Design a protein around this ligand. Structure first.
Ligand SMILES: *[C@@H]1O[C@H](CO)[C@@H](O[C@@H]2O[C@H](CO)[C@@H](O[C@@H]3O[C@H](CO)[C@@H](O)[C@H](O)[C@@H]3O)[C@H](O)[C@H]2NC(C)=O)[C@H](O)[C@H]1NC(C)=O
Ligand SMILES: *[C@@H]1O[C@H](CO)[C@@H](O[C@@H]2O[C@H](CO)[C@@H](O[C@@H]3O[C@H](CO)[C@@H](O)[C@H](O)[C@@H]3O)[C@H](O)[C@H]2NC(C)=O)[C@H](O)[C@H]1NC(C)=O
Ligand SMILES: *[C@@H]1O[C@H](CO)[C@@H](O[C@@H]2O[C@H](CO)[C@@H](O[C@@H]3O[C@H](CO)[C@@H](O)[C@H](O)[C@@H]3O)[C@H](O)[C@H]2NC(C)=O)[C@H](O)[C@H]1NC(C)=O
Ligand SMILES: Fc1ccc(-c2nc3ncccn3c2NC2CCCCC2)cc1
Ligand SMILES: Fc1ccc(-c2nc3ncccn3c2NC2CCCCC2)cc1
Ligand SMILES: Fc1ccc(-c2nc3ncccn3c2NC2CCCCC2)cc1
Ligand SMILES: *[C@@H]1O[C@H](CO)[C@@H](O)[C@H](O)[C@H]1NC(C)=O
Ligand SMILES: *[C@@H]1O[C@H](CO)[C@@H](O)[C@H](O)[C@H]1NC(C)=O
Ligand SMILES: *[C@@H]1O[C@H](CO)[C@@H](O)[C@H](O)[C@H]1NC(C)=O
Ligand SMILES: *[C@@H]1O[C@H](CO)[C@@H](O)[C@H](O)[C@H]1NC(C)=O
Ligand SMILES: *[C@@H]1O[C@H](CO)[C@@H](O)[C@H](O)[C@H]1NC(C)=O
Ligand SMILES: *[C@@H]1O[C@H](CO)[C@@H](O)[C@H](O)[C@H]1NC(C)=O
Ligand SMILES: *[C@@H]1O[C@H](CO)[C@@H](O)[C@H](O)[C@H]1NC(C)=O
Ligand SMILES: *[C@@H]1O[C@H](CO)[C@@H](O)[C@H](O)[C@H]1NC(C)=O
Ligand SMILES: *[C@@H]1O[C@H](CO)[C@@H](O)[C@H](O)[C@H]1NC(C)=O
Lengths: 318, 172, 172, 318, 172, 318
């Protein structure tokens, strides 16, 4: 005349998940395993950040007038903007991506004098395309002209030996004029040739005058070359003309990480995954925001949602 | 499930059960009553949370940039970079889908197994004193008050006390 | 499987069953007879077809050429390309092998569970009226004609009609 | 007195599959998940196909006599054959793989005149290695000779400015003569030098005469260079000798796909996965035919067969 | 352990069993005795060995060098090589972890199923002649000597011999 | 009054493993699936091994005095040491990594004479930086000087045609002097220029004298260039000065493998997986030793240990 028995709980509305041999099974809970939300700011607290403005990353080695405050910087995070430029006189670098990748993780630079001295020539060439309070040039290079118009140019040689414990970075430049008369007016008449020598490096360069399209009101060009020096070696420059002499050498310090972005900076935050739109802060193992994120980030998938079951099957009454 | 208890010989669940996943329901001369079971709920919740924690684990590795989005790179190397990235993405998507499907398949079977184990444990206690009707629960052949139900619930039921009366009722 | 029904206490299958996966076989005074079940076959077929449909899903991604087979490319980049391709191939082969093994393992256990559930339902239907023999066969202690067997096959069997006669036959 | 019993079905002969902890389990059904058959034709219906014969892909820019009908083509699928050649005069391109990859997805080209005009010098240089009805040259370039044997060659400059909205493609060439007397005979005595300038480009070139092995009865060589022009910029050429001048500029249109094959074309078909032997049409997730297939193709594996179970374990009657 | 036999209603294992994984333990008037079972031990060992052999399998592929550790290579290509290698390592580590976890999950369930199957077979062998106490032990209602126990062990038990005496003892 | 019972075995101390929804489950037995031990030797039996000492891999083509016994070698395994060098006179190769990768699998080289002959000029240039029993040069190259100090140098041309069935390898060199006066003293006055021509190759080279840092007591440099010849073609060299003439051509034979290591060699062993510290001999599917192993090796993972269960759950008596 008595009866006792058992059952399980149920809910009115469940959630649909996917199993091995079915699609759309209803359960009580499920959770999400894919991240789709971000913070539209560069969150950085506890680290030193440097926000380059109009200054390009490669300009800090040469020093155009727009990079006067980043000549010797220290940072743990480096941010580059879209409007940055690293030239005041028309020209470009050679093999620039490798240099950018090297400098992105450097964590800063330190400058040291070289000690070169010159006699019998003029070393104060100035142009109107780089203006500080008049006509000026790059802050860390010298433009060696002739004594007077249509004069000669003696053949010269210079040398520098590394002393410190770490490898050094050396940068020089070559000038291509906009005519065959300018090469004569400035550097004199005749052939011109420069040569750069080291233990693991021996190259020669020769200018090529010609007419080109006008950029910033100029027709000439400047080409920048670079090399790395082991901490016992010596570098020799032999030249007769068309030389942009260096003045200082750079040494790296520490390590850091660099990104490219277009949003502002927040100093009250914490994050480790950055992309060009903000920060990704989550504990889920997958993300569906950007495929080129850098740092400590989750994995990128093409799916938009993937639900993971948490309760039993849902069997509602009647 | 593949144990045939949930959505098997038990028709539907109860929406009035709010303090557990499994429970009892008794009726006798005094009235009706409901309760809940503590061991099975904890057993399921334990590695439901275990699976969640195992999935949440975070592995450290740092990646950097290899291309530029302001000034483009040489075509022949950018093509290779894009090819490699597209190759990796498919592998990761396939892995995610397979893992989610497998875990979803396992959980339901675990819950069904727990329900079946509880039912069998309760059945084994009332030897030769109760009968099965097939809808999923028992009928008693003697007089059982609230104390007897409470004893059944917490595994303190002695079948030697009512054996003779139950046998006489069942035989004739 | 791990339920011990197929290749367990059931010795062998029947080659005369052509309209289903499971069925009954009865013998009484009038003669012999055979039939088939519908629900279990449908469940097994349904989940098999679900697996097949889930397997042939197509992902849309397009790939292009990166090397030339008429004029060769520079050695240093071709070596890298070949290395990457050889790296990817092993991953895909391993994934295919693992997936096939897992599915093959799951299917047999599913079928065994279905057979066990079908057996248990019929065992529960005939309470205290039949006796088990240990080979998948039941012995009935009363007179059961064709209508009785048909009412056993579909779930409309009432055990109160023959309770007294079966009890008297079993006791003595 | 009565008895009821239960059982399952079986078959006389089954199929062997592999499980997690056993090899060679016999079941009632199994199916195959790896594809091994193909159609030995390029099945293409619903798309425009262009089948280049003796013409090479890079020839359509310069126009040798064997590419006279593919100067301005439009297609959705491009097929290249093994016998295609893109030179009538000995020479080769520079950075050819990148140009080929660019052109394979272009979907076609369109030509536009430049408008250069010359005075004094001759512009009808012809060779016997490219014959249409006699002696002729490339259909889209001009060979600038001198007025007469052993004469002067005035230094000149030319310019062209892009106008359309899309980037343009510019191609020019440099001629390396066989001997040194030939250089004097065709362009006069003295040094020769050419220079090419733009906003993002400043290069110089100089011919290098020298004796080589005879190809097609000739000893000289021609080197082709190319550049891409932004949609608002200008390009300048300054030269004194050894110049092959362009005549038309090319613009891309649309998008397409390109393959390399050696079989015929079938117009009554439908496919999306091509390789060098035909087409692959299947719904199976894996393939074991080729590893360099292009399009929308299944995954490539090394295994030859993989069987998937479709039934229960087979237990035949004793 | 979703079959509820090991660490279920069986309290603990035996440390005196050294010649097998499962066994019997009998007690009668003459004294106590212990034995072991051969079929289930072999059934478990076979699939364990199969898993090991399937894991040992070795796939033939050869790789070579692409960079130098005495003189460095150009930066732009070394960065790509390092990036690709770091990408592959994570995939392989994840695969290893998942495989090990899955196999470890399967093995315990297999063993539990084997134990449950043996218990169910022994229970089905004795019909209406023994009673179940709920801890893995059976109570016999007649007189059983060593020969009867040995017959029970190796499937040579005929319940018709002692049916009347056992029934009379159970009723009274 | 009889009773029968069932049970299972147990052990006093078990091993902890990880499952799908638990960490640290105790079982009766377990094994390890990650390899962490090696043999600190290069185990190699059944194959021919060549152990280069001070000789570099690229030296065997040119033959400095330290590579006198490896001019024509045959091997199945090649080992390179850290102290190897391939130059006796200061200089370096151009595009060296590709050549090293080509040579690492060649399996040996074979030398064949070329047959060049010269008249008038001298061919016995010697230096003090490469000493055998005095002053000597590379064993497979010739240094063509002038008849006497500050004399002329006639323009010359030479040619060589392949005859064998397989492609050949050609190597030549260019000399950059340490000043503009040594060039006059050795090769005479005036401009200098060399040109190399083939069917699929045409290039020109010109020396660049200058002052550099002293290496091995010398200031000049030598640059080595190489090319591959299809097995029916011809190569032509035209020169007036600054030429280091080849003397023999190289042909590959067979196939092999190459490694870099720093341990000794054991002739009683069997192995197929090598790295820079020894050999890896195991049947386990994973390894955690080195990520740059070569040969037939297990997969590399970051985890230190991964245990696989081999028994049931452990429930000790209590
Ligand atoms: C390798 O893949 C990347 C990623 O898709 C390719 O870069 C993408 O190139 C397209 C085509 O120019 C860019 O679209 C353009 O974006 C600009 C700026 O938003 C917009 O003004 C244009 O109207 C156009 O939509 C796309 O932004 C760019 N993705 C980036 C930079 O992340 C790249 O071209 C591929 N490599 C090669 C060799 O094709
Ligand atoms: C990267 O891998 C590809 C293929 O996986 C390598 O290309 C293959 O190179 C071999 C060696 O020459 C070719 O074998 C030859 O085939 C021709 C027929 O075309 C036959 O006449 C020869 O006797 C010889 O058997 C093979 O065909 C070719 N595979 C292709 C083109 O698909 C490639 O060399 C590898 N990269 C590097 C840098 O080695
Ligand atoms: C790509 O990754 C490899 C590592 O697999 C990088 O090579 C590693 O570079 C570091 C930094 O120089 C080496 O560490 C140094 O080793 C010298 C050996 O004498 C030691 O004296 C220093 O104190 C320092 O520990 C490391 O050995 C080296 N690993 C090798 C050669 O196996 C490589 O630099 C990466 N590529 C790029 C472009 O960064
Ligand atoms: F979004 C996606 C991403 C990947 C696939 C996919 N790719 C396969 N390749 C080969 C075999 C099976 N494959 C599947 N099936 C999925 C779903 C079913 C279980 C196995 C994994 C399907 C949808
Ligand atoms: F054709 C192939 C391709 C890959 C492997 C293979 N590689 C492994 N690496 C590490 C561990 C297990 N591994 C396996 N076993 C396969 C088969 C057995 C189940 C697990 C996956 C074996 C044969
Ligand atoms: F050492 C490692 C290496 C990789 C992971 C990992 N990363 C994941 N990302 C996304 C999803 C699952 N993921 C897992 N595995 C989890 C789930 C499977 C069982 C083990 C834990 C965890 C630990
Ligand atoms: C599911 O779990 C969440 C917390 O994880 C909580 O809202 C509740 O327990 C469940 N929700 C529903 C709607 O059942
Ligand atoms: C450089 O080489 C010299 C040569 O012996 C040695 O004395 C010195 O320690 C090395 N290092 C520096 C920083 O000079
Ligand atoms: C079980 O329930 C009965 C009924 O109230 C009670 O007397 C007994 O103390 C309970 N036992 C335990 C262990 O809680
Ligand atoms: C079950 O089968 C019997 C066969 O005699 C039939 O009479 C009865 O209607 C069936 N039940 C249902 C619900 O159709
Ligand atoms: C086995 O499966 C195949 C695949 O669909 C089917 O064509 C065939 O009829 C099946 N055979 C049997 C006996 O079930
Ligand atoms: C781009 O070309 C248009 C032609 O309509 C011209 O008006 C415009 O000034 C050009 N852009 C620049 C930056 O000069
Ligand atoms: C089973 O054991 C009994 C008792 O020893 C023995 O007589 C009989 O022969 C055994 N049966 C078999 C098949 O070994
Ligand atoms: C565990 O397995 C190993 C080899 O598989 C064996 O040597 C060892 O004896 C086993 N452990 C025990 C307790 O028997
Ligand atoms: C090379 O070409 C000549 C004809 O110029 C031919 O006789 C010879 O057979 C060719 N050599 C080979 C190896 O085919």
């Amino acid at each position: 005349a008595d009866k006792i028995c058992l059952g399980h709980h149920a809910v009115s509305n469940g959630t649909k998940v996917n199993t091995l041999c079915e699609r759309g099974v209803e359960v009580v809970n499920a959770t999400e395993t894919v991240e789709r939300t971000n913070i539209p700011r560069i969150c950085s607290k506890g680290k030193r950040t440097v926000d380059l403005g109009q200054c390009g990353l490669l300009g800090t080695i040469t020093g155009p007038p727009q990079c006067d405050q980043f000549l010797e910087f220290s940072a743990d995070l480096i941010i580059e903007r879209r409007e940055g430029s690293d030239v005041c006189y028309p020209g470009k670098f050679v093999n620039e991506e490798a240099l950018r990748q090297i400098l992105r993780e450097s964590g800063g630079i330190d400058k040291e004098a070289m000690g070169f001295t010159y006699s019998g020539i003029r070393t104060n060439g100035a142009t109107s395309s780089c203006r500080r309070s008049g006509s000026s040039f790059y802050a860390e290079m010298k433009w060696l002209l002739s004594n007077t118009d249509n004069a000669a140019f003696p053949q010269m040689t210079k040398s520098y030996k590394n002393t410190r414990k770490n490898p050094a970075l050396i940068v020089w430049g070559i000038h291509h004029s906009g005519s065959t008369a300018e090469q004569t007016k400035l550097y004199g008449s005749g052939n011109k040739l420069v040569t750069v020598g080291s233990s693991n490096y021996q190259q020669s360069f020769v200018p090529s005058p010609g007419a080109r399209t006008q950029v910033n009101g100029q027709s000439g060009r400047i080409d920048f070359h670079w090399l790395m020096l082991n901490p016992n070696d010596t570098v020799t420059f032999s030249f007769n003309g068309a030389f942009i002499a260096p003045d200082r050498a750079s040494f790296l310090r520490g390590k850091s990480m660099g990104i490219q972005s277009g949003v502002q900076v927040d100093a009250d935050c914490e994050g480790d995954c950055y992309y060009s739109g903000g920060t990704i802060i989550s504990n889920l193992p997958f993300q569906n925001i950007d495929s080129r994120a850098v740092g400590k980030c989750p994995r990128y998938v093409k799916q938009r949602s993937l639900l993971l079951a948490t309760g039993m099957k849902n069997v509602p009454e009647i | 499930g593949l144990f045939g208890a949930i959505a098997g010989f038990i028709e539907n669940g109860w929406e009035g059960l709010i303090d557990g996943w499994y429970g009892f329901r008794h009726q006798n001369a005094q009235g009706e009553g409901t309760a809940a079971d503590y061991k099975s709920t904890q057993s399921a919740i334990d590695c439901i949370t275990g699976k969640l924690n195992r999935l949440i684990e975070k592995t450290n590795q740092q990646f950097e940039l290899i291309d530029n989005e302001f000034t483009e790179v040489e075509k022949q190397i950018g093509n290779v970079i894009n090819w490699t990235r597209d190759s990796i993405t498919e592998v990761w998507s396939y892995n995610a889908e397979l893992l989610v499907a497998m875990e979803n398949q396992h959980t339901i079977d675990l819950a069904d197994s727990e329900m079946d184990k509880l039912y069998e444990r309760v059945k084994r206690q009332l030897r030769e004193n109760a009968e099965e009707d097939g809808t999923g629960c028992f009928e008693i052949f003697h007089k059982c008050d609230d104390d007897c139900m409470a004893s059944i619930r917490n595994n303190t039921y002695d079948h030697s006390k009512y054996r003779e009366e139950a046998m006489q009722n069942r035989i004739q």
